[PDB]
């Protein structure tokens, strides 16, 4: 029942179920505005894609790519599986303030199901040819997925320069679980100013949650 | 009704009340094992303390010394106000698996009541003669207070070299309110191992919460 407008939106969601508690008492919410940074010695994320993009489902929420097994990243010696990837417009994230007018999220889990998702904004500018493959078929109404004629690395939709931003959060969607490991890539991809429009009209409103209070948190850069 | 033992004991806390619920679902409790570090470009903690503890106060959980307002330190540019400091043997956070024999709380909180703990590792070594001053009067039994007949410094607790550890984290005794900001001084502190077991005696046992998952956190370091 929850949505990104209305009287089942953001402000609403605590409200809605008890399994939707820590929407209202949480503490460690995401997203947030990138405004108490700190520089780190944090290391690099290690990457370890293949293409395995299979299909792209439209579930009233965003557009969601999944990802077959055996794709992952390294967090802290740990082996987390990326999952599915998919996007919201504008922005969840701000940076001092600022919003982008596109972020995908790739989420990933570890055999534990711990998760941790990447986030990268993407900027108005020249045509992803990525996104382009995804939007082609992009489906239209909500339960409705296709799948791919051609597997997507979704290694080519991150930046090449691998600096980012890490914090401890949660889900940006009900339960909005914490427990969540945010790597936030400090280096924008681009698209379109037609292939933001195309996701906007689809989605047919804004997909972002309302940023939340860093609180105790500080915001960790590499 | 909770304790630090038995069937009331750390374990089981989430299932004694309702308002309780955080020390069963929460992914960003305290203590911690602190064992995953980042050097970190922190700034330096301002402590702006005054001669001002009054009273001390055994609550059956620990030993409390209240202290007058007008004393505080600054976080990420907020004021947080010393409202009490207290203890726990042997120590709730542990450094890289081991224990210290004992651990100093020192509780702030904003003028919106978000909180800031700074913690204090002390070792067996000599006689600490601050706190002597306090276990000198030190009240027996649960619910008994004492004045203090001088004002204690807090500062004179803490250690002269202010590098720490941060993270976010907890209350370590129900309800285990997230959103704290906790300091752990990096340098030790002293006191005598009679001190330590006139504590322990008088407070019947250990009174130190287990350790909790560090989760998605890092710890960063000054
Ligand atoms: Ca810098
Ligand atoms: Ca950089
Ligand atoms: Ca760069
Ligand atoms: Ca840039
Ligand atoms: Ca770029
Ligand atoms: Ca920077
Ligand atoms: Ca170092
Ligand atoms: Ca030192
Ligand atoms: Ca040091
Ligand atoms: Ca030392
Ligand atoms: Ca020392
Ligand atoms: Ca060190
Ligand atoms: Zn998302
Ligand atoms: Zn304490």
Same mark, same amino acid.
């Given at each position: 029942g929850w949505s990104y407008h209305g009287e089942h939106g953001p402000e609403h969601w605590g409200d809605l179920k008890?399994?939707? #508690?820590?929407? @209202? !008492?949480? $503490?460690?919410?995401?997203?947030?505005d990138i405004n108490?940074?700190?520089?780190?010695?944090?290391?690099?994320?290690?990457?370890?894609?293949?293409?395995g993009a299979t299909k792209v489902l439209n579930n009233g929420h965003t557009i969601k790519v999944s990802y077959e097994p055996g794709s992952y990243i390294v967090?802290?010696?740990?082996?987390?599986e990326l999952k599915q990837f998919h996007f919201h417009a504008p922005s969840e994230h701000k940076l001092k303030g600022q919003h982008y007018?596109?972020?995908?999220?790739?989420?990933?889990?570890?055999?534990?199901?711990?998760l941790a998702v990447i986030?990268?904004?993407?900027?108005?500018?020249?045509?992803?040819? #990525?996104?382009? @493959? !995804?939007? $082609?078929?992009?489906?239209?109404?909500?339960?409705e997925e296709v799948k791919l004629a051609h597997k997507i690395n979704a290694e080519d939709l991150?930046?090449?320069?691998?600096?980012?931003?890490?914090?401890?959060?949660?889900?940006?969607?009900?339960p909005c679980s914490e427990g969540?490991?945010?790597?936030?890539?400090?280096?924008?991809?681009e698209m379109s100013k037609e292939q933001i429009e195309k996701?906007?009209?689809?989605?047919?409103?804004?997909?972002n949650r309302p940023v939340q209070p860093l609180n105790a948190r500080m915001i960790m850069e590499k």
């Open positions: 008890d399994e939707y #508690i820590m929407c @209202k !008492i949480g $503490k460690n919410q995401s997203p947030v108490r940074i700190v520089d780190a010695k944090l290391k690099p994320i290690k990457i370890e894609y293949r293409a967090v802290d010696g740990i082996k987390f007018p596109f972020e995908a999220h790739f989420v990933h889990a570890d055999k534990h199901g711990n986030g990268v904004f993407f900027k108005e500018g020249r045509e992803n040819p #990525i996104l382009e @493959k !995804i939007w $082609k078929v992009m489906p239209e109404n909500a339960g991150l930046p090449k320069d691998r600096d980012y931003y890490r914090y401890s959060g949660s889900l940006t969607t009900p969540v490991r945010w790597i936030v890539m400090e280096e924008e991809m996701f906007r009209k689809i989605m047919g409103g804004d997909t």
